[PDB]
Amino acid sequence: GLLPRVNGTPPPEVPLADIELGSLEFWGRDDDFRDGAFATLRREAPISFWPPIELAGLTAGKGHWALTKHDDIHFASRHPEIFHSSPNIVIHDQTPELAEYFGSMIVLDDPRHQRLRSIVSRAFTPKVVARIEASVRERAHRLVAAMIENHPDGQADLVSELAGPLPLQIICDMMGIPEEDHEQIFHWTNVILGFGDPDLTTDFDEFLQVSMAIGGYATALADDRRVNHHGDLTTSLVEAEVDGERLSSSEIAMFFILLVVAGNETTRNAISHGMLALSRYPDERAKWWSDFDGLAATAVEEIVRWASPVVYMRRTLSQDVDLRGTKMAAGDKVTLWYCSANRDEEKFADPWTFDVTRNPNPQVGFGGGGAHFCLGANLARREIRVVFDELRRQMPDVVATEEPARLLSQFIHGIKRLPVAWS
Ligand code: HEM
Ligand SMILES: CC(C)CCC[C@@H](C)[C@H]1CC[C@H]2[C@@H]3C(=O)C=C4C[C@@H](O)CC[C@]4(C)[C@H]3CC[C@]12C
Numbered sequence: 096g097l098l099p100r101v102n103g104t105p106p107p108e109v110p111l112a113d114i115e116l117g118s119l120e121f122w123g124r125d126d127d128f129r130d131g132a133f134a135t136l137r138r139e140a141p142i143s144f145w146p147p148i149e150l151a152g153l154t155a156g157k158g159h160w161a162l163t164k165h166d167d168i169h170f171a172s173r174h175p176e177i178f179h180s181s182p183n184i185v186i187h188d189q190t191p192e193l194a195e196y197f198g199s200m201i202v203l204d205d206p207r208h209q210r211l212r213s214i215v216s217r218a219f220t221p222k223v224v225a226r227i228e229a230s231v232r233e234r235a236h237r238l239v240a241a242m243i244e245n246h247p248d249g250q251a252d253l254v255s256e257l258a259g260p261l262p263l264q265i266i267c268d269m270m271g272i273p274e275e276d277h278e279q280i281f282h283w284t285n286v287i288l289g290f291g292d293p294d295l296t297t298d299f300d301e302f303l304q305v306s307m308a309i310g311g312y313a314t315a316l317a318d319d320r321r322v323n324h325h326g327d328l329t330t331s332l333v334e335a336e337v338d339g340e341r342l343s344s345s346e347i348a349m350f351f352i353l354l355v356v357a358g359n360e361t362t363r364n365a366i367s368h369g370m371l372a373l374s375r376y377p378d379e380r381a382k383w384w385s386d387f388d389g390l391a392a393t394a395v396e397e398i399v400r401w402a403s404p405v406v407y408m409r410r411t412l413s414q415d416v417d418l419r420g421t422k423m424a425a426g427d428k429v430t431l432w433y434c435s436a437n438r439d440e441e442k443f444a445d446p447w448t449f450d451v452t453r454n455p456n457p458q459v460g461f462g463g464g465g466a467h468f469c470l471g472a473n474l475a476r477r478e479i480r481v482v483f484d485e486l487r488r489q490m491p492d493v494v495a496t497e498e499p500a501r502l503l504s505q506f507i508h509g510i511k512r513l514p515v516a517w518s
Pocket of ligand 1: 200353355362403408461470
């Protein structure tokens with residue numbers, strides 16, 4: 096049931112008049128239409144203004160300027176003195192009731208951002224990730240083995256059985272979340288980054304119920320670790336002193352929520368889109384499987400470029416900015432479309448070819464660099480690598496058998512369900 100594709104094919108041309116970045120219906124279209132829309136913007140309207148989507152649109156606040164060029168997204172990322180992460184990194188205004196749960200370091204500027212990031216950043220270094228490499232592989236090995244055992248007919252949903260669980264288990268392990276609570280945590284983060292998709296929720300009170308629930312989970316776990324320290328990130332949070340003063344319970348909960356949402360709702364889509372690409376372009380599977388360790392570094396970078404799991408991130412101007420002939424005003428919202436930068440014809444020879452040997456590969460799936468560069472980048476790369484190594488070893492012919500069920504989202508390039516089959 097997988098539709099045939101030809102590597103290197105550009106999307107059909109999308110007329111400039113047909114693009115509505117502010118409509119839910121646009122984000123419901125398939126990737127060819129979306130990719131073609133962003134190609135048209137790069138060529139004919141590389142900076143342009145759009146209204147918020149209608150999803151909770153009455154409280155969204157103002158519209159935004161869309162940056163579609165790799166170099167413009169780079170400039171914005173590298174100059175937070177102009178393009179601020181405060182007050183929010185999605186288009187929607189962060190209302191007071193949302194700020195209760197989501198006013199974390201990701202919506203702060205330096206120096207407070209850096210002081211918060213430094214509490215945990217040593218647990219995400221390459222050498223620390225190398226320590227828990229063996230744990231990461233054991234968890235991936237066991238999940239892939241369970242897929243074979245749980246599905247003797249050789250068919251299953253890659254997302255529920257592997258792509259979701261592996262990153263979930265790792266970040267829960269690093270936070271010190273008990274094994275019995277994994278499913279509950281994943282349900283909550285699925286809803287928090289699925290608002291607007293009816294398979295997740297379209298009811299904002301249910302969203303607020305979930306946010307309440309994970310916030311209360313976080314504070315209860317932090318309260319236990321304050322009494323009895325463990326060697327986990329939650330204990331690092333309760334123990335930290337920023338200029339002699341400890342974090343508030345509110346600050347601890349927001350930080351906890353940031354880490355588990357980010358760890359649960361990103362890598363899984365790199366894996367699902369990676370499987371889809373290897374299914375559509377079998378020469379690339381054949382190349383990688385023939386020399387997994389020789390090709391893994393370039394293959395992992397190309398999977399992130401192809402998937403762009405985070406579609407965009409917002410910034411806010413503190414001064415007037417005249418960029419590429421477009422005059423934007425102090426206080427305007429500006430959006431950084433990584434999904435577009437990662438197809439930029441000025442930065443990639445042959446952007447429409449999925450090439451697991453690609454080098455160089457200046458992909459900005461982890462953002463354009465700078466102060467908020469993805470804290471989990473090293474971890475995510477290892478998570479992707481070990482999952483595909485275990486699929487290669489245990490079920491080398493695993494392939495998608497249907498087009499995926501796509502998450503309805505402007506922010507997250509989500510695959511909800513991906514049927515696969517193996518011999
Ligand atoms: C392939 C997987 C992932 C992708 C594509 C991705 C993408 C991103 C992007 C685009 C940003 C914003 C960068 C910027 O503003 O310049 C970000 C920030 C962040 N990510 Fe990742 N992410 C991934 C996996 C993870 C994982 C597994 C974690 C584990 C906890 C994580 C934790 C974070 C955190 C904490 C931040 C905020 C950093 C800060 O504000 O200083 N991410 N991520
Ligand atoms: C992908 C990761 C790297 C980052 C995750 C960030 C998470 C923890 C946080 C940071 C800011 C939060 C959003 C917000 O402030 C406003 C709204 C509007 C509301 O109508 C629906 C929910 C939404 C999109 C929030 C969803 C959760 C977000 C993205």
